[PDB]
Symmetry: none
Subunit: 139 residues, 10 copies
């Protein structure tokens, strides 16, 4: 069952990003805090939509896609990925990682249903690395 993040925490994090900036160690610590439980693509996408401005959000979408593509290359380079399965029918496509696959587009409940925990942690680590890249790039 999907539970959304508190809008109070999200508002506090957005104001933190607004006053301290993207690169302060306190901001990265707060992001790591709100990045503790494995989030669904819907959660991370809406979170970055709210806390980041338009241009940093575009940059972050780009960087997240690139990092997810590196993850999928490593996944096709190793059939023992915690997102993959043993047979070929469990291979994870980027539509399933970005939340674009069938039964997931716009629906967080179905998303949480079909996604694997390894998928969730890989998406989360990818999003964190992308946030770091964009923060280092913006300023």
């Amino acid at each position: 069952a999907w539970t959304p993040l508190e809008p109070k925490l999200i508002t506090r994090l957005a104001d933190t990003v607004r006053t301290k900036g993207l690169r302060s160690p306190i901001t990265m610590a707060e992001v790591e805090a709100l990045m503790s439980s494995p989030l669904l693509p819907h959660d991370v996408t809406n979170l970055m939509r709210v806390i980041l401005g338009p241009a940093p959000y575009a940059l972050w979408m780009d960087a997240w896609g690139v990092q997810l593509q590196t993850v999928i290359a490593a996944a096709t380079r190793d059939p023992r990925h915690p997102a993959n399965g043993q047979g070929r029918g469990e291979r994870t496509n980027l539509n399933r990682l970005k939340g674009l696959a069938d039964g997931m587009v716009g629906n967080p409940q179905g998303q949480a249903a079909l996604l694997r925990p390894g998928e969730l942690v890989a998406i989360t680590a990818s999003a964190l690395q992308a946030f770091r890249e964009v923060a280092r790039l913006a300023e």
Copy 2:
């Protein structure tokens, strides 16, 4: 209106990109038509210094994020 957005003579590029992406995504366009429109608005708006900077790109930029990164790298510091 997205088609009326110009980069002011004194405005920075990240502010212009923010305003343009905001107005394009918060509009009546289909979701599959936002990225090409944002790119072609970066190319035709964004006063002729950045226009020529994007035009003379040895690589082909096929995403608003890539265009923003390229312009932020090679922009005229002033």
Copy 3:
């Protein structure tokens, strides 16, 4: 049986040569078209008399004679020429090639009677090569610069035209065109080609790259 070429086609070809010139690729294509069936010496001679002026016609007669002489040297160097025969009595003299032999002077019917198909195709190829020589002779790449106001496609057209219509070997045109794109083509495009993350190894690829990344103005 001899059938003459249509004077309508000949008139159209003559006007083509008159407006486009001798060296245009459309003119050479039209000549190749009217040079499709093997022609008798009478046909080619009258054709060149009509389409060419007096001085180009003199030049063409000279060049045709020289090429036919080269053909006859190759023929005496190989008894298996499609114009020759196996015995010595079928050896082909230049009087038979130029239409000057006995029973042929001024008579196209007798010409078509005694001539061989190999003779006809050899005469035709010789006449085509002679036309090419005279066209190259009747009418400088290293002096071509891209003007300050000229576009790049016009400069590329002019340069490729002057390089391909010159005295260079066929295997030396592409490197010369590339190195002229790099050193001519005023320093904005020079730097645009210099800072190419990929290696461009063909004039078409250079043209495509420059057209993509050119400064719209």
Copy 4:
């Protein structure tokens, strides 16, 4: 037996390209007209040599090669290509498509002898698509 295209039609088409340009719908209609019967590589090559200038001709050679390479990739991806055969001995190489194979270089008669009708129509469609690309690129 190979029959050449009329130089009168070719001259009219060249003047059409000269006055109207490469991208006008009348020019594309005229090209489609002269692209009606399946042409041999010799025919299309000489046609583009005559109607196009030097730089558009270079661009068109590039684009034609790329499109023919895509066709050959689809052909090795499906052994039922109208240019291919059933056995491996009928596989069509790019030397046979561009007219560079043995018994074809410079000779249109031999070309017409060895080429397949599927080969001809594939070459023709490839050349038409390449012309469209170059026309969209030149202006």
Copy 5:
């Protein structure tokens, strides 16, 4: 009249040769006297630059076509 034909100061050589050969072949001369007359008119008409170009020919030119080819090869591009 063939004997009144001169190469103009600004005229090219192929035009002069065309005009001269036309006027000589369309005249009252015998057929066996046209080539020598055309040659000797190339040598004495055809203003002194081309006159000296034909005079200093290391080879002997014995045909109007050969003279035309030689002059077209070694002519002063201008």
Copy 6:
């Protein structure tokens, strides 16, 4: 000191690369840390024209020799 080496405004690139590789290999770094340091010093030193030349590399350069070859190919002749 390797971390203080900059490419001078008038210095060529091969001299800068020679000086940098000399100072990096003749230093206290482990042997397995010289190539990444040389690459990242090529990218951040080597005044912004070559910086942008290396940045806009359609291929990924993963060796000092490859970076040197690429820069020598596409450098601004001056």
Copy 7:
């Protein structure tokens, strides 16, 4: 038994490379001289370490690897390579060519023991080609003009140097040199070459003709 190259010859070659550069014909001749006997990977590696600077040495390592890889592709394309054997157990791996195989790393004696003469000559030719590539890379013909005050032999020297030390095929240098003599080489010499009663079909003949008939000044 392995014998090292003299450090005196190596010092002289290093100073030659230091003063004349990498691309001078004297330097390439000296390298060919010290590349006479088939060298072991150790010898060539140390030689290039000593005579080349750090950055040219990196470039040369890259180029040597690429050329050796081409050699190994040709070797797997032909089982009759003088480095290969008849059975599959003699196939030569790049670890054996670069001296990285077992029993060879750092030991020139063992290297000389296990290596084949065909292996040695292939390694040597590969290293020579790599040196040529790097020399051509470390340091434009179509931009060369004869200055208003420059003599013709200096212009010819500069032009032939820039054309032969370029990326053109070997069969395209003479026509390019001729056509550059004709279009460059300021209009006095241009007209001198144009009005040549003989046909000049070689750069040497053009140079001789121009030197004979040049305007002494």
Copy 8:
């Protein structure tokens, strides 16, 4: 067995030609010195490539060809040439003199194998006369 000339002697001769010029009697004496043993076409060709500039090298190639052609005319005028043999199968072609014959192109070892001593001395004398001509012509 072929032995190359010392690059030290060649460097000294090149610097002599660079400082004294082509026509000084000391330079001609040095050339005669390095022209003592009969050289293979490879040796003389590389020697003139190194000691002479580009334009003098072109002139020297021309002059060497002309002198070798005179030698071959004298050889066909006398079947007792030290380069020729008694039968017609030993007649020496210019491809064998210039090093262009089969088994010689680029290979000095094979060159030294197939060449005659009379061939070598004729090539050497021809090259010396050509050097004299070019030196008299350059200045």
Copy 9:
């Protein structure tokens, strides 16, 4: 004395050639040394206009008569 003969600034070329050939043939030279001396005196005397006229001879002139004919053909009428 033959080696002191110069073509005067106003003198024609046939007079200079007559004087030079007279002084060379009526001197103490061997008979086999007169033609080369006459040629080399035509080339070095005979004031620089004719010197350049002889220098730029597309053909090789190997006889005093041929040099005289060439110069008389291509001389500057004045």
Copy 10:
């Protein structure tokens, strides 16, 4: 037996050439008059030495040599030349025509001894044509 031409006639002809020029019809008639009997190379050579200036004499020597060479080409093209004989031992060399052969150099008596009448008339016609050429060339 050789008889020299009168110096009075030669002086009158020289003054005629001096006043009327080389090309006047009276001068050519006078030359034809003094060219009536077949002259030996000595006679014609001295005659042209006396009547012509230095530069016209050089031109005339050139033209006479060229015309004699044409005559010798026609002679080797026809063994029935009045200067030639039937066997190969009577073939006439240019040394015999120009008076340079053995037993003739400087001696007019020996010249008249060994020369043929056909040789004399050929030399005379050649000299007359050369005089015509030089006269047409001088003015």
